[PDB]
Amino acid sequence: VHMTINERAGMSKLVADNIIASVIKSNWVVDILDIEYTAEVMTPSEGYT
């Protein structure tokens, strides 16, 4: 399932855990469109922080 979450609002937290657990155990690809995020491209030397 290529689930497309246009808006996370109103979602049960248990439903959220279920969707992620679907991503893991059924290989779902879920596309959360609500999110805004900055990104930093870390070098291999420094690793994630």
């Binding site: 609002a9 109103g10 979602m11 049960s12 937290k13 248990l14």
Partner: protein, 49 residues
């Protein structure tokens, strides 16, 4: 002939078939829910009935 209903006639009758639950109805697993609020009050749609 079919049997006359006990309420239909004036006789008192001291043995009767009473239906009953086999054990207590109030098991104690009362229902509980995940209320989740609207994200932004301005965005709420009052409209449409």
């Amino acid at each position: 002939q079919v049997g006359i209903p006990k309420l239909e006639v004036d006789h008192i009758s001291f043995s009767n078939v009473v239906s009953m639950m086999t054990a207590n109805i109030r098991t104690g697993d009362d229902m509980a829910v995940e209320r989740v609020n609207p994200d932004d009050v301005r965005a709420i749609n009052i409209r449409n009935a």
